[PDB]
Every structure is written in structure tokens, then in C-alpha cells.
Write a protein that binds this ligand. Structure first.
Ligand SMILES: [Cl-]
Ligand SMILES: [Cl-]
Ligand SMILES: [Cl-]
Ligand SMILES: [Cl-]
Ligand SMILES: [Mn+2]
Ligand SMILES: [Mn+2]
Ligand SMILES: [Mn+2]
Ligand SMILES: [Mn+2]
Ligand SMILES: [Mn+2]
Ligand SMILES: [Mn+2]
Ligand SMILES: [Mn+2]
Ligand SMILES: [Mn+2]
Ligand SMILES: [Mn+2]
Ligand SMILES: [Mn+2]
Lengths: 92, 99, 87, 108, 96, 77, 104, 91
DNA sequence: ATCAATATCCACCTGCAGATTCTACCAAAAGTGTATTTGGAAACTGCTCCATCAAAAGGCATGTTCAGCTGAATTCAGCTGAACATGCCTTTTGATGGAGCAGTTTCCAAATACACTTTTGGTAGAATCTGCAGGTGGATATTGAT
DNA sequence: TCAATATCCACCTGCAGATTCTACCAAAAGTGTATTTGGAAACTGCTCCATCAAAAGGCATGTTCAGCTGAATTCAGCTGAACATGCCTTTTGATGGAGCAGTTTCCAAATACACTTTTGGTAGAATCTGCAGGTGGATATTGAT
């Protein structure tokens, strides 16, 4: 009986932003719901993007455009900044 | 010394502050559960439920009703009333696209 | 082989004071007497719609147990995404 | 063989790039998936998680609590215009609502 | 000389325009507006003709529906005249 | 350019919406509302345009924007 | 021999099958799935065209136009429900005036 | 090239109203319609298969998706037609 | 509560412009003949949770009383918004170039797929650890009074 | 101003829930080979954009007044506040066993691939439907009794 979740990563992030703060199990469940939800939205939009443009590959470009479509304003700008930085660091 | 009495509305407002401060479910657990099981049984007999399934249904229902009461309240106030009435609910739901 | 007492008229379990509490959280100060029955009808419709879809998923999975995920999927596909009940 | 380095570490991330890649592969989103796509996605998911946790932590401390509960998540989300927009059709279980009484309802 | 009472011609116009399907905003100013708004998102843009027509069909459908809800809000308040507060109530309840 | 959406046009739209009487303040309000709507849709449309590496907004760009905003449009595919 | 002919359909079973295979819906597609789907799509098309044809005939037109489609759809409770968040271009709206706006 | 459902829509139209035609705009709306419902049903079927850890979309997923997406009588008649079509096809 | 006068709506008309239907050519898509693999159903079986009940304590639902205050009904006029006439200018409609883009096609370097082998981060369960729920009690702030 | 009441605000500790610890192993990472694809280069028409021009009809403006909205006012009956009563919910735990998951096996059903046959998209020709205006009767509105 092995069940995967985003709990440990959410917790690592939590320790990054609020070092002396914890989180209840219920709240962690809401965070896991959140990550899965956004995963689905972004991946789905990217899939649609690739399809519309007759591409068989979802690339970081599709992810980025999906992010711009789905996220409001500054949230979108900040997210794009994080993703871009991560991809360029990964490439090096 | 005539007994104490708050004027109509004071306790209501107090209750608003109280329940907007908190997060506990406002419908009784067991009666809601019976409601869910009755309704589900009229679709398929002999169904069982995960505990968290019924709790999920209750969270969804109460969130839905609370939001509906917000919109209903706005409709009542729009009509220069302070009392919500069925027509307020019906307007809110008509504009929501539920009706 | 020891079934529960048959469920009937349970919508009345959604009591007047419960509906009042829900309305209070919704910011309502004053409530017409006809609201309560109205609320019940509305709630029942909502519940019916959700549970119908939920049970459909349950039936597709060839299960006899409605799961939290069945409900979550029903809600999602009805545009009322619920957080906290995955896994 | 070379010593194992994880893609998350290579990308400077906390969220799991490998796992995200697998989920993209098996979610039937496209026939092919670029190397940068799961990195980008993981980074975005991590960032958004960080923003919500930041605000929720703030609310928790405002309430003199050291542990984040659903209430704090709801306060954080609804008091932030863009998060509120993003999660506009989402229910936070045990979140409650923002305190708000219409002015006309208050005594004179 | 003849004069219709206030409301008679309004009702006539309602029947007239609910009977028909033609676009109700002028083409050129709408196009001008669309290009202006678009410029603040991306430079050097061109538009397919049918893209502008698509935007106009969508916009007019949106406004007509909003006016339906607005009207319902006005009538709710025992008025027959729509006011900005009616629009604002409709848009708040829509989740806009 | 928003003032190019004239008072009689807004009146015609309201008539189709079943409105019999109209406050003078409606028109400006309507314009603001229209602008917001347009902005949102167009913002998404152009995003699609940019993803396709085009300089021309197509009918499909608009249709996709509308669809993803829950305002599905038939007739322009 | 075509699959549509074997299924008693007008809608294209082969094309629907290909669109399912290439739409990134699942890794595999059963043989009956595109038949079922094509049948459903054809049914709904038939229902809408039936009513729209009626509206066209009332308007003494031999050709169905968007207006007739809108009339057909909005005047049918279940079709209207199915297409609740859909805009029919050049469809207009149903004639409808609130009673309070009328004289007397 | 550029695909549409136009010829099939026209065949159906000829079935239900032999002496009735259709305008270009109306045909465009019918094509939009068919694509829309295709996407709704296929997408729900995809999710159904995923939720249940199945790699195959079968007629059962289509049917369940139809039951989820279509209201009442439309759902019942659609289910009837799909089932009938699959039965005629199989033999 | 009808009438006479008047204005607009709504079929119905014809002629012919143009929108739709018909046609024919031809890549591209579906079909087909075979071969081969595999997803998932069937049959098991272990072992979680789920259904139902039980007791007891007290939180909360119900029914009652009654009066404050709200919704509903009504009155009235000021000023807004409708209707209509008038004449100006913005949009519509049409012509003409041509520059900018879409939209295609070819071919390798680069990217991704996927299998095998190997390693480690992620998980479940156990062991620690510790907020905060309630329980207490007093300060402070609000309320409604006669 | 007070009496009455509710809410606010520290303070306290124990234990239910949260975090950390441990160690096995599922799945990610390294590596190598096979297969797909992105883009730079070189094209070709084809939609738009820019520009010019006339003229039509839609809009802007000003006037008059009808009637709608908002304010003021009055009243009766409904809903909120308070209280007793006692029901049934909540909490905690027992007892069976229904029904999920977990494994293993093996065909019916699906994919793969090479090649032919059939079909649907496209653009111009051939048909034939709407529509642009114009008529006359139906219908509806207005002002006067
Ligand atoms: Cl009412
Ligand atoms: Cl990539
Ligand atoms: Cl206003
Ligand atoms: Cl099948
Ligand atoms: Mn029953
Ligand atoms: Mn197998
Ligand atoms: Mn009042
Ligand atoms: Mn006057
Ligand atoms: Mn380790
Ligand atoms: Mn406490
Ligand atoms: Mn192993
Ligand atoms: Mn082979
Ligand atoms: Mn052919
Ligand atoms: Mn005419």
C-alpha cells in the first residue's frame, strides 16, 4: 500500500518561507488538492496548445503560454520568472 | 426591575460576527448523513459510503448555501429590504445560471 | 442482513436553526418565514445533482462504495472544485 | 558511471521534476514531452505553493498560531485579489468566510 | 401633431430588436477599439476580418445577456429603469 | 475610442436585452464594463497568437480565448 | 464497405476513431467507442436539425439560418440546458418582455 | 486538408427534412456544435479511463460520459442510439 | 370602457443578385489483409473499513409568548428620461496598390524515446515531540434603559 | 450615568495530532541506441493594411412634458429575543462481514505495418432562394367622451 503525494515538498517550501511554522494534516490535504488542481489546469492547457499548433511535443513553451493564460497578472509574471530561471539553470 | 432584552437585530448581528469568525459545519452531522444516504439510495440501492465522502458532501453543501445566502442578502438589500425572502433566492439563482 | 431503519423525509433534518446559522455566516440579519422551506428545496436539488454524478462514477468503477474521490470528481465536473479530500 | 544528480537539484527546485515528468508522460497530454517542460511546471507549482504558504503563514501568526490550518489558507486566498481570482471556483474545506457585514445592516 | 406616450416606442424597439439578429454596434469604431486595446498587450499586431467579427458577436451577446440580468435587478427593486447599481449587482452575482 | 460605442448603440443592445427605460448614467457604466470584457478576451487571444509565433490574430485565437473564459462561441471555426 | 454503413450511420465512424486516437485521450481506443460516439453526435445533430427545420418552415424559408438554430435550441429545455454557456453567432435572442413592462 | 462535418450534417438534414437547406453560417454553427460535443464526451471519457487506471477508452466510457454530460431524455435517447449502433455494427 | 383618427407592423408581391448546391479532380485518409502483443477480466483471497447498534451525557431543537420594528401600501412632485425634429459628420461602401505574413517543403543536427542496469529519495510505520483546545477568571466594551 | 451582558485576552497543562526517525525498496537517474522533429533557408500567393473618395443614414443636439423615482408617512402583523423542556445528536467502542485491493493467468481485443481503395475538400458552374423595396390590410395606440 504505497500512496504518493506532494506533502514533503510542500513542507520543504513551508520551511523555506516560514521556518518556525507548521501545518495541520487537513491544511496539507488542501495544499495537495491545490497542486494537483493546478497541475491539471496547466498540463491540459498545454496539451490543447500543442494540439492547436499541430505539435506532438509539449515543451517549456507550451507550459509558459499555459501559465500566462491561466494565471492572473503579476502572479503570471512571477511564475514565468521562476519557470524560466529553473529551465535555464537546468540546461546548464 | 424589568428583565433584560436585546433589541431585534442586536443578537442577529452578534451571531453573524460569531459564525463568520469560525469554520465549524453548521448542519448536524448525523441528520445530514441520513439525507445523503436517502438521496443516494434513490439512485442505487445498497450503496456504502466512505466517511470522508459524506464529509466532503457536507463541506460542499454548506459552502454552497453560505455563498447563496451572500448573494440573496445582496438582492434583499438591493430592494431596500433587510429581510431575505424567497424571491431574493430565486433572483440570485436566476442570475447565477442555476435557474 | 440487518439493514437500517428505512430513511424517509430526512430533508427536514436541515433544521430552521441550522439554516439560520448558515445564513448568519452568509451575513444575513433578518429572515422571512418562507425561506426555510425554500432553502430545503434548493439544497435538495444541489445534493441530488452532486450525488447523481458521484454515484455514476461509482457505478462506472463497478464499486458499491461511494468514495471521497467520486464526490470530488462530481463536484469538479459541476464547476464546484473542492480542496482537501484527495488521497 | 557518474554519480547521481537529481533534476530537481539541477534546476534548483524543491518540487520533484522526475515525478512531474512521469505524471506528464502518463497523463496522456501529448505524445512527446520536452526536457524543459517538467522543470518549468515543477517550478511554477513550487512558486504558487510558496505564495499561498507565505500568506497563510502570515495569517497564522496574525492569529498567534504557529500551525497553519485551513482557515489561514482561506484568509490568505480570499484576501489576495489574484489568488482569489485563480481559485475563484474553488472550495477550501473548513475555511469559513471572510468577516463582512453589509453597512446598511448595522445599527444607526 | 401625433406623439406616442413615454414607453410605447421603447416597447416597439424591444420587439423590433429581439426579433432581429444584426449587430448593434457600428463596425469601424468597434474595430478601432479592438486594435487600441490589443496594442497594450502586443506590438505590431494584425487582425483577421473574422477575428474582429468574432469579438463583436461575443461582445454584443455578452452585453445583451448582462442587460437581461440588469433588467431583472431593476424590476426586483420595483423599478422599470435600469441604473448602474443594477449592473453592478448583476456582475457581482455573476462572479465578475 | 471607447466613446465610439455610442449611446444609441448601447440603447439598442439594452432593447434586445428587454430593457424599457434607461438611466443616463448607464452608458458610461456600460462602456467600462465593455472595456473590461474586451481586454480580458483580447489578452488571451493575443497570447494564443504569440504562442503560434504569428503577428495576425485569427478567428480561432479569439474562439479559444472565449472558450477558456467559459463563453463558448459557435460559428467561427 | 464502410464502418458507418455497417453501423447504420451517416456520421463518419473512421474519422471519429482517428480523432479519438490522435486527440490524446487515451493510449488505446476500443472498436465500439467511435461507433457509439458517432451515433450520439448524429442523434443530437438530428434533433437540432429537426427543430430548426420546423422553425425555418414557420418562417416560410427553405434554408435553415442561425436564427432558426437559436430559436430551436432556446425553446427546447434540454437542448438549452446542454448549450447553456454557448453563443450562437447571429442567433439573437428569444422574444421576451417582462410582464411588468407592459401597459395596463 | 481542412476538415469539417458539413457533408454528414447535410445528409442528416436530408434525412429529417428532405426539402430543407441550410445557410453557410448555420452550417458553421452546426460544425462548431459537433466539435464541441465531441470534445466534451471524449474528454470526460478520457478522465473516466484515467480515474480507473484503464488505458483504453471503450463504448462503456462513452456511455458513462454521455450519462454525465447530457440531461434527461437527451441522455436516454443518446444512450439508446449508441447502443443500437454498436449492436448493428458488431454483427 | 367605448369610438374615430392615425401610425406602425406584417404578410405578400416580383425580379434578379448572389448564396447555395452540384460537379469533378485528386491527395489524403480510410480500408484491408495479416501478423503479433497485450490490457484487463476472471478468479481468487486477504484484511481494511464500513454498517449498525449500544449507552450516556448534555448540546441543541422545538414550541411558546409577545412586542419592536419591518415590509407593504399610499401619497405626491420634482426632475429625469422619452419622444420627436433637424442638419451635420462619421461610417459605410468601393477602388487600388503592395508589403507583410502564412503557409509549404527539404534535410541534417539536435532532441526525445525507451530499454537495461544501478542507486537513492520517498514512503509507511514507529517513536518523539509539542501546539493549542478547553477550562478558568478577570478586564473591557457594548447595549438599552425609563 | 448605570446595570446587565457579551466579548476580549492572558494564563494554564495534557494528549491528540504533528513531526521526526528508520530503513526497505519503487522509481528516478545514468547510459546507449533508435527514432522524430525543429528550424534555417528558400520560396509563393493571399490576405490585410494604408490610402483615397463619395455619400448615405445614423447620430448629435435642443425642446417639451409625461410620468417615474424617491421621499415621506402610516400601520398591522411577522419575525427576533428569551426561556423551559426533553429529545436525539455526539462521542466512544463493539461486532460482523461486505467489498476493496492485491496476485496470477491467459485470450479477446487491440496495435502494428504495408499497400490499395475510397472519400471528402476544394473552386467554379449551375440553380434557385432571399431580399430589397413597395403595397394594403391587420393591429394597436391615442385623445376625446
Ligand atoms: Cl417572496
Ligand atoms: Cl522543453
Ligand atoms: Cl445607480
Ligand atoms: Cl469499445
Ligand atoms: Mn428511497
Ligand atoms: Mn498483462
Ligand atoms: Mn420599512
Ligand atoms: Mn408634473
Ligand atoms: Mn537516503
Ligand atoms: Mn481556547
Ligand atoms: Mn522491486
Ligand atoms: Mn508486425
Ligand atoms: Mn466523393
Ligand atoms: Mn422589406
Amino acid at each position: 500500500s504505497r500512496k504518493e503525494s506532494y506533502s514533503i515538498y510542500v513542507y520543504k517550501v513551508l520551511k523555506q518561507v516560514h521556518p518556525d511554522t507548521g501545518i495541520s494534516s487537513k491544511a496539507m490535504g488542501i495544499m495537495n488538492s491545490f497542486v494537483n488542481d493546478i497541475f491539471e489546469r496547466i498540463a491540459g492547457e498545454a496539451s490543447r496548445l500543442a494540439h492547436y499548433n499541430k505539435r506532438s511535443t509539449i515543451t517549456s513553451r507550451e507550459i509558459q503560454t499555459a501559465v500566462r493564460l491561466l494565471l492572473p497578472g503579476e502572479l503570471a509574471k512571477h511564475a514565468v520568472s521562476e519557470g524560466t530561471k529553473a529551465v535555464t539553470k537546468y540546461t546548464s | 426591575k424589568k428583565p433584560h432584552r436585546y433589541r431585534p437585530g442586536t443578537v442577529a448581528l452578534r451571531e453573524i460576527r460569531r459564525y463568520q469568525k469560525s469554520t465549524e459545519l453548521l448542519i448536524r452531522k448525523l441528520p445530514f448523513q441520513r439525507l445523503v444516504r436517502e438521496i443516494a439510495q434513490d439512485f442505487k440501492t445498497d450503496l456504502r459510503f466512505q466517511s470522508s465522502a459524506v464529509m466532503a458532501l457536507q463541506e460542499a453543501c454548506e459552502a454552497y448555501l453560505v455563498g447563496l445566502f451572500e448573494d440573496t442578502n445582496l438582492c434583499a438589500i438591493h430592494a431596500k429590504r433587510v429581510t431575505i425572502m424567497p424571491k431574493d433566492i430565486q433572483l440570485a439563482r436566476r442570475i447565477r445560471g442555476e435557474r | 442482513k440487518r439493514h437500517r431503519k428505512v430513511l424517509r423525509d430526512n430533508i427536514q433534518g436541515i433544521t430552521k436553526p441550522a439554516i439560520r446559522r448558515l445564513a448568519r455566516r452568509g451575513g444575513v440579519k433578518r429572515i422571512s418565514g418562507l425561506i426555510y422551506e425554500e432553502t430545503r428545496g434548493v439544497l435538495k436539488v444541489f445534493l441530488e445533482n452532486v450525488i447523481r454524478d458521484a454515484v455514476t462514477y461509482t457505478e462506472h468503477a463497478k464499486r458499491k462504495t461511494v468514495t471521497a474521490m467520486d464526490v470530488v470528481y462530481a463536484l469538479k465536473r459541476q464547476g464546484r472544485t473542492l480542496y482537501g479530500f484527495g488521497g | 558511471r557518474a554519480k547521481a544528480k537529481t533534476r530537481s537539484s539541477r534546476a534548483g527546485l524543491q518540487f520533484p521534476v522526475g515525478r512531474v515528468h512521469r505524471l506528464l508522460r502518463k497523463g496522456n497530454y501529448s505524445e512527446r514531452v520536452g526536457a524543459g517542460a517538467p522543470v518549468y511546471l515543477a517550478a511554477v507549482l513550487e512558486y504558487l505553493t510558496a505564495e499561498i504558504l507565505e500568506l497563510a503563514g502570515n495569517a497564522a501568526r496574525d492569529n498567534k498560531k504557529t500551525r497553519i490550518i485551513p482557515r489561514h489558507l482561506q484568509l490568505a486566498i480570499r484576501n489576495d485579489e489574484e489568488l482569489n481570482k485563480l481559485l475563484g471556483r474553488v472550495t477550501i474545506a473548513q475555511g469559513g468566510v471572510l468577516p463582512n457585514i453589509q453597512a446598511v445592516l448595522l445599527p444607526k
